[PDB]
Amino acid sequence: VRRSQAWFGRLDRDGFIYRSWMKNRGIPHDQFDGRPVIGICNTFSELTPCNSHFRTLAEQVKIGVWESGGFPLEFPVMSLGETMLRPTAMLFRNLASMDVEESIRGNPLDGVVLLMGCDKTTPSLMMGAASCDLPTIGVSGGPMLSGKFRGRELGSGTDVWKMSEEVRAGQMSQEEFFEAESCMHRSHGHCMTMGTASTMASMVEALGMSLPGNAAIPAVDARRNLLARASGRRIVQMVKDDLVMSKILTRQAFENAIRVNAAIGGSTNAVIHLLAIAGRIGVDLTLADWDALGHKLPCLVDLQPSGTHLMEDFYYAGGVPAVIRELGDVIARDALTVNGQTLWDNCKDAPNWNREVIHAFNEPFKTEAGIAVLRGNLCPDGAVIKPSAATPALLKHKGRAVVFENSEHMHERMDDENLDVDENCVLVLKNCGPRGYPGMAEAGNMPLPPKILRKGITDMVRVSDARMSGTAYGTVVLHVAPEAAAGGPLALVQDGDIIELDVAARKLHLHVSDEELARRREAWQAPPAPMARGWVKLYVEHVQQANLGADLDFLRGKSGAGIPKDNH
Amino acid sequence: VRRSQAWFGRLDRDGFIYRSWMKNRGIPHDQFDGRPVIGICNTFSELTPCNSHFRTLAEQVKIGVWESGGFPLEFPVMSLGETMLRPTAMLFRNLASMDVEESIRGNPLDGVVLLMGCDKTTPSLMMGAASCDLPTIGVSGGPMLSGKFRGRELGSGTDVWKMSEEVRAGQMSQEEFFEAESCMHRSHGHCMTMGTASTMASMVEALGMSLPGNAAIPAVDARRNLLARASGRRIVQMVKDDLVMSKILTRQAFENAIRVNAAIGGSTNAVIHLLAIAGRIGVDLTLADWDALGHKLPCLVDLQPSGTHLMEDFYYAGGVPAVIRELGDVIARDALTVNGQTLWDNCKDAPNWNREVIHAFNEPFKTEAGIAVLRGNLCPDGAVIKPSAATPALLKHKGRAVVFENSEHMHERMDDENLDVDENCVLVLKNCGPRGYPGMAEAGNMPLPPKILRKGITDMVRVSDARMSGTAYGTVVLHVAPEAAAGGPLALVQDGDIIELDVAARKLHLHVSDEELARRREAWQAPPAPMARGWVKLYVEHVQQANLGADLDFLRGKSGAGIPKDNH
Amino acid sequence: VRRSQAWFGRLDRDGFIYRSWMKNRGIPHDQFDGRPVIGICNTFSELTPCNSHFRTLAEQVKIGVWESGGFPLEFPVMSLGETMLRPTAMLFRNLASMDVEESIRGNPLDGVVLLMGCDKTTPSLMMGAASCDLPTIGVSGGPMLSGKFRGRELGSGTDVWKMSEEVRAGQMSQEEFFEAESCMHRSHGHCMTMGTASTMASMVEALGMSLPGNAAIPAVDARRNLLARASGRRIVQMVKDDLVMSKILTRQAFENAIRVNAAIGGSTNAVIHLLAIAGRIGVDLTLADWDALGHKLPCLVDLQPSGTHLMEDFYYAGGVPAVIRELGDVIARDALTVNGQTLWDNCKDAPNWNREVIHAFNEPFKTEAGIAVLRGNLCPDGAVIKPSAATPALLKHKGRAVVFENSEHMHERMDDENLDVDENCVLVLKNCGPRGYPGMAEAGNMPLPPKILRKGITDMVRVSDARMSGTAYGTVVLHVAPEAAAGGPLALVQDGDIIELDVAARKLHLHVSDEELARRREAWQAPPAPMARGWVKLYVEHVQQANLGADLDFLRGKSGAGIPKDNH
Numbered sequence A, B, C: 001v002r003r004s005q006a007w008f009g010r011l012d013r014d015g016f017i018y019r020s021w022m023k024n025r026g027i028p029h030d031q032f033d034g035r036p037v038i039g040i041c042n043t044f045s046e047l048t049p050c051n052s053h054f055r056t057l058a059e060q061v062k063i064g065v066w067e068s069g070g071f072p073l074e075f076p077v078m079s080l081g082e083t084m085l086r087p088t089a090m091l092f093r094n095l096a097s098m099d100v101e102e103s104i105r106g107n108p109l110d111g112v113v114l115l116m117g118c119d120k121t122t123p124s125l126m127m128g129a130a131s132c133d134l135p136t137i138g139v140s141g142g143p144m145l146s147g148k149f150r151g152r153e154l155g156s157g158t159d160v161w162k163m164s165e166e167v168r169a170g171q172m173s174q175e176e177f178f179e180a181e182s183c184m185h186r187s188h189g190h191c192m193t194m195g196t197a198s199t200m201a202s203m204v205e206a207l208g209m210s211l212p213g214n215a216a217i218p219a220v221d222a223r224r225n226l227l228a229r230a231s232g233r234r235i236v237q238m239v240k241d242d243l244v245m246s247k248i249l250t251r252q253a254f255e256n257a258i259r260v261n262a263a264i265g266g267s268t269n270a271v272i273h274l275l276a277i278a279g280r281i282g283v284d285l286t287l288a289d290w291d292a293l294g295h296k297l298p299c300l301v302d303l304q305p306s307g308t309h310l311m312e313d314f315y316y317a318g319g320v321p322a323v324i325r326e327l328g329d330v331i332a333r334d335a336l337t338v339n340g341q342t343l344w345d346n347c348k349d350a351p352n353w354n355r356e357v358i359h360a361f362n363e364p365f366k367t368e369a370g371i372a373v374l375r376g377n378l379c380p381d382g383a384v385i386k387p388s389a390a391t392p393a394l395l396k397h398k399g400r401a402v403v404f405e406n407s408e409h410m411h412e413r414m415d416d417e418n419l420d421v422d423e424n425c426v427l428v429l430k431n432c433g434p435r436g437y438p439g440m441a442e443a444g445n446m447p448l449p450p451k452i453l454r455k456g457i458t459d460m461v462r463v464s465d466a467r468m469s470g471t472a473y474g475t476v477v478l479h480v481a482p483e484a485a486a487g488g489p490l491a492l493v494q495d496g497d498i499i500e501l502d503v504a505a506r507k508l509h510l511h512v513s514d515e516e517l518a519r520r521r522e523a524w525q526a527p528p529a530p531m532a533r534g535w536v537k538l539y540v541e542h543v544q545q546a547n548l549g550a551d552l553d554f555l556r557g558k559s560g561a562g563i564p565k566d567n568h
């Protein structure tokens, strides 16, 4: 027996209640006979343009379930369109996780199918489902087609920062920049660079939570429907075999995902998200793990932002299975995946059709290009930097600090010609973390002063307690914890202070005495409440720091999928 | 100038971000020209069978918006199916209200259209929308068609309690009970009795938050799509006129809703939900308001569970507009509604095609049938009763107490033949309120002891801190506040205590002295935490008592719909 | 006053009959007020996999109509799947044209939108609509994305013939050829080469019956939905201006289409369809017009089967507008199109992003590559050849005839190793035209004898009364009229006869005297009737020859769109 039979299999007065209303639209009674009921978490939304094709994806999963003798039922949760949600989509990631967890536990579901696409929709669904630990399979929406503009190609996000900086440098017209928005995005799917959505989709696959190939298949490609449908077939058998998430999301699975993230030039936001997911399913995973596991690992994928190619090219080259094939000596081969096979059984024979996109391990795209975690007096709980999309000569750098108290203080001063700034200066941004912004917005890749861009300089060192887009680039220190709004030493950085950056030495030092800092702390008053009410008030007072996953403290962990009380 | 232009009217890098991704599915550029952007809150779910036709309602709304030059964008929230969500759907009414609120404020919305149907989905969206106070219109899903079984009609919920008690009384076979579960619910829509869904849909029309006729139209009737489409045309004009919910949900509106709630034989759950809605928009509404404005009014709608007819007969007889015209001497005629006309302008000429369903005021269906609020030592913060469906002989009753410490203990002892109980005892159920159950389930309509059902007695006095299905009946006092789990004197009732009920005198008295209650209070301990993690832990530690609306304390109020900071 | 008000404007018993039933699903009364009723001819079909995305295209047109104040109403016709229908889709092109013509006239339509994709759905809808001559606009479905197979690309149809001939020659394994059917077609849309569908979409734009850019936009590209929705807006204004088809399909329009067909390397099936379309709208057009207009015009588009690239490259280079701009010195610039502008207005400023796909006029991809019409005793009523995909050395050839009496006989003899044939023979196929097959199948591109394929020769001279696929290639003489089954001199060709081909001289000669042909004609008998009843008995007994359009004799012409009588 399984939990859905505690609803539909009842011969009580409640059994009438649990079935009669469901039969109002024409459901045959044998669908309640005890066959696996499959809940399909559908994040479709016309406010989430990257998941706007998920109704077509949902009917595809339902088919596979109907084929394997299951009972498919889709349900909605709060969807998270990254380009639309302000202050930031991350502010509502934890709220969506409660939609997922409660909708799964409260309903007669034996298995779960997760429809994930834009960035924040992947962790929110993974976090919520992990707190229930039912047999779960993830289906990604797929990346968009490559943008086609004036005979060349455009990259999601990566070319937004690039073309924007060129407009402010006087190197690109402002009219041309705005004509490219109908051409950069011409298809269904998520951001088609190696941004958060592409990496999280790769993380879902590398964790074993999806069928092989789930990450790279374009949304408008027919193979995306096949995989969504094959996932509908598989989840029915997963219920019969009781292949729960905890049997897949193990310590080794997370170790493989971090190794793959380094090889694919993955986004820095995967660090926060996988720590949040591990905190729900129960796997021990710290921020120090990310530096130790990705240690000395190379980047094998020549894709934007770290490279030049796009997700469409990454798919035709072999996708994630071809990347896991290169990692055969560092991966945990025996890690189990949701299709019944190991991660190595599904990738040992993966073909590679383009070595200019997916390199061989021993002659890779970039060496030692995994995400690095920095330690120092400036970031006690840690900080991250993505050297694959960085410039080499800046990974070891020290210079004068130019300080911005927040985003409004920054946008004002960055465009100031009277700003005393150089090319070897350190731009510092504060109060943009979980409590500060609030929601830890993607403002880490802050634009450079216009007079610096006019000299051909496109990158300089930058430290902040904020995130940045997975599509962003530059030597940017991110997730400085504790954030300035929580009383972190970052809040005390002042103009003229000396910042020491040493990614090789894992060092981020603030050259001012502890005595000087200590008296600077006498002035620091905590920022006021952003809102005295609502979800944001709950978020700020309960959100954890970025080094733990930015989850709410009372949501950490799991409560299983036991059968609750009846409703009457 | 409206808030969407803060996304779609920006002429910098952020304007590229806010528009380019939206163009990925072929949206013409002129849709971002500042025309009203309409958010359609779609609660469609296959786990919410009463809202399972909401894709059809959503596209019908889109049309009306397209017809009148608006930009429609639908978005999902957590859906709440009564029969599916356990321990009860009320446990997640406040959660989905956060989904609504944050989805409205976080996205570039000018106006909102609320797709509501299944019980809790109506207050869930009204609460979240009121906390933003954008121009909003409500569209109800409509009731199911009358169930046809063996040449006779069945009623949603009401006939479930009736047929179940007849099986327990050895009067109706168990065979006939389950053969009627596919014949009771035969079409799309919500409960076709005057349950919560029918009541709440009538409240939306009474509050003025919908177009006239929104309440009664059966879900499969062509006029249902027409109203949803007419609402799509109206909301864009409401955005142009800035007709926010504040100008609709005034105190006069809530009083009008209370008044028609008595005339239609409305559900007791409307008491809790309208208090929660008022607690968001900022109108002072109390339990005492329900008592003073409601009870003296008669019942005019001969519908189950107060009468015998169903929602189909109620729509063909004239629906809510015909009922309101009968209340012309007691309503606030000048109350503004979303269509631009007053509440009385929309109903002054509403026809009445069947008097046997909608009685005249001077010749009503039942006299003094409004919900009564009982005061006394047993409920210091209040309790409610629905005399429109109760036994007249029992509204004034004194009796010995048969106490049940919880719902599990009730099911154990209720059918125990050794139970010392006659039909003149008072049944007491503890620990089923917001904290105790948790979620305050619909357990107030306790099934009677089988030894008493064999005598032909179908109703006894019943006291509980729990809610009750709007389709239920009998002399049952509900919403006893504070609940037993919070230390309310209901927790101290013991077997043998004399409990006095006098609905006319507004009395619910426990015949135990204060000095003895003080000794009982010393032995009372708060029940252990239902969960040490997750949404349920947050709910138990923050939910208010039923006399205030069963809302979360930090969600109480409103924050408007300002323009939040950029997300990059 | 329009046709619609003869239905919806009637104020009597018939007006009740025409509005009441239409209001059964919830259509507001103001949709019958006189606004343009727009019929959307939807060829969606799961048996027409190239039109299987047309439900999405239909919904986009409805929007455009709702935006502009029209009344959209979609209706189905017989859909024609090229790869699915047998004996051939051409057999059912004239049947589907009767569905289109009668549905437009029988129903209250003021304007028409034609959803066309798969090969035969384009002319069958153009023909039926031209016989009504209402304000009509055409929307093409778009081509599929380029096939991706083992690091390289695959082309629709063209690579099916190539890989097949290499399997028969022993150069490609049989397993590899079948592992490429999942990888050739991997998205919605029609054939991705310059086949009939791509050609017909280019003809619709060249004729002016579509908005600019309609031909090349891939089906899964966002601009495809944009154009379909923009067409829904435009058709309403066309009804108001009464811009009927005959104002677009003038003589200069067909002349412009024939010129574009040469520059794009279009299909030979375009010749038959444009003649049938002209035979409906009332424009005198002949094979001689095809030869004279395309005479020495160059091919500018380097796509398969004439070139190497695919439709994706064609769209990203500029599509048809860029091709028409190259033809600015030969086209009739002032030809009016459905968007109100001339063809030159819509193309004079068209950009060209890839000269390697779309060549300049004076530096063309191939010179004198227009379709050539051959005359001579072997084809008194004409015969066509597509030298854009033929062998230059074979265009002037004299060879001994190797004859096959039918397709069945050709399947047997071709792979016979006893067959006396060399590379300099002339393959002759009989009885595969309109009456012969029946339906004139795409059997003209005969597979070569394996003993010659193994010698490295992939092209021989081939003559038949059959058609060729638009994706086919080689020195293939086609559409020999009158067909063999109609008594044409092709039926009298015997093994050993000398056949002279001279494309430059426009000569196809059979070296047999008239006196000897007269003796052979005596023994000739018409083949038995394919069937004794049904559609194909009517087809065979009424279809005209390929030199006139292969239309049915009694369907030739038009009848307008008058107001028929009342159905009651």
Ligand code: FES
Residues within 6 Å of the ligand: A050, A081, A082, A083, A117, A118, A119, A156, A190, A191, A195, A197, B021
């Ligand atoms: S915005 Fe959807 S993934 Fe980049």
Ligand code: FES
Residues within 6 Å of the ligand: A021, B050, B081, B082, B083, B117, B118, B119, B190, B191, B195, B196, B197
């Ligand atoms: S079950 Fe949805 S209305 Fe009661």
Ligand code: FES
Residues within 6 Å of the ligand: C050, C081, C082, C083, C117, C118, C119, C190, C191, C195, C197
């Ligand atoms: S198969 Fe439909 S276009 Fe060729």
Ligand SMILES: [Mg+2]
Residues within 6 Å of the ligand: A082, A119, A196, A269, A442, A468, A469, A470
């Ligand atoms: Mg992101």
Ligand SMILES: [Mg+2]
Residues within 6 Å of the ligand: B082, B119, B196, B269, B442, B468, B469, B470
């Ligand atoms: Mg209820």
Ligand SMILES: [Mg+2]
Residues within 6 Å of the ligand: C082, C119, C120, C196, C269, C442, C469, C470
């Ligand atoms: Mg064809």
